[PDB]
């Protein structure tokens, strides 16, 4: 229904704190050069260009790298690790720190950062720094600009989710629009590497408009039987779209797709408003009814005059589109 939620809030990541610095620079390493890029040790996300990737770093070497990498450029190489999670990463994206902050208060380092993916690269090699830090030797992939009909057709469905104000979002440039759409499909990772290793925007839109009407239901992954949700219930509470990336107080990164109705889920504990990704809403842990696999959260209203009194955020790592 109507949403007087101010969907700009989810993209602001207010939960991450107040005093944040707001670097307003940019950099775009050459369109075809072998580069050495520092990696984040634990981030397992498959980052797509144009995505916001919040991060909460606690490890001393991670903090050191971010602090020393804050000055000289701000790009770290987030690999897209294949189904073989340990190493065995062949491609990836570069992220650029655009919101940095330290917090020694409470006697702990804890660096909170927000970076957005910029480029795509093939990892020619992977050397190890002297302190548990991966320096990746990567050759930047080219953007193969070779169309309008496909973009309008995709908008035809992008409007059903979170009826759009106007073309302000979804940039006109085919590459930007294709990447933004790809960041929202609830598809799994194996299809995400293929979508990332596409290339020209045309085949990307043809793989996105391909998997927009074919997939039928988002279901439990660890058991594969429960039917959690369908696209008819999908909707976006943030400008970024139905799906986005958030961080829990422990640093883990979750891709939570927002839906109106989910089934086969049971709630654990009581609603809380601590570290809530969506201000003004409370979250309750949700687990599937057949194998107790943590699937997401049920957000409910907590203030006066809130439009959606209840929705669900399902973590994409436990959903298998079908």
């Amino acid at each position: 229904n109507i949403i007087n939620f101010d969907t700009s809030l989810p993209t602001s990541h207010t939960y991450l704190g107040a005093d944040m610095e707001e670097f307003h620079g940019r950099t775009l390493h050459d369109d075809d050069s072998c580069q050495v890029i520092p990696v984040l040790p634990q981030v397992m996300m498959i980052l797509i260009p144009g995505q916001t990737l919040p991060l909460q770093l606690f490890h001393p070497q991670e903090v050191s790298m971010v602090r020393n990498l804050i000055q000289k450029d701000r790009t770290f190489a987030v690999l897209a690790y294949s189904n073989v999670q340990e190493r065995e990463a062949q491609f990836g994206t570069t992220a650029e720190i655009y919101a940095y902050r330290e917090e020694q208060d409470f006697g702990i380092e804890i660096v909170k950062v927000k970076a957005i993916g910029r480029q795509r690269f093939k990892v020619l090699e992977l050397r190890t720094q002297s302190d548990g830090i991966q320096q990746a030797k990567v050759q930047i992939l080219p953007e193969c600009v070779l169309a309008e009909t496909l973009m309008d057709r995709i908008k035809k469905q992008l409007r059903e989710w979170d009826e759009n104000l106007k073309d302000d979002s979804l940039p006109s440039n085919p590459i930007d629009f294709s990447y933004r759409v790809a960041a929202c499909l609830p598809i799994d990772d194996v299809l995400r590497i293929q979508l990332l290793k596409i290339g020209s925007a045309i085949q990307r839109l043809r793989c996105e408009l391909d998997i927009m009407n074919k997939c039928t239901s988002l279901c439990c992954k660890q058991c594969q039987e429960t039917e959690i949700t369908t696209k008819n219930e999908i909707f976006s509470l943030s400008l970024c779209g139905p799906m986005a990336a958030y961080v829990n107080p422990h640093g883990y990164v979750h891709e939570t797709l927002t839906v109106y109705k989910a089934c086969n889920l049971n709630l654990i504990g009581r609603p809380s408003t601590e570290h809530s990704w969506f201000p003004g809403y409370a979250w309750t842990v949700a687990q599937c009814k057949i194998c107790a696999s943590h699937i997401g959260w049920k957000f409910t209203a907590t203030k006066k005059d809130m439009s959606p009194q209840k929705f669900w955020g399902l973590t994409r790592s436990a959903l298998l589109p079908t």
């Binding site: 208060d105 409470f106 809380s272 408003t273 601590e274 570290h275 907590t302």
Partner: peptide, 10 residues
Amino acid sequence: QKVEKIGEGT
């Protein structure tokens, strides 16, 4: 001087 986080209320 802050020592720890307790939680979030209303």
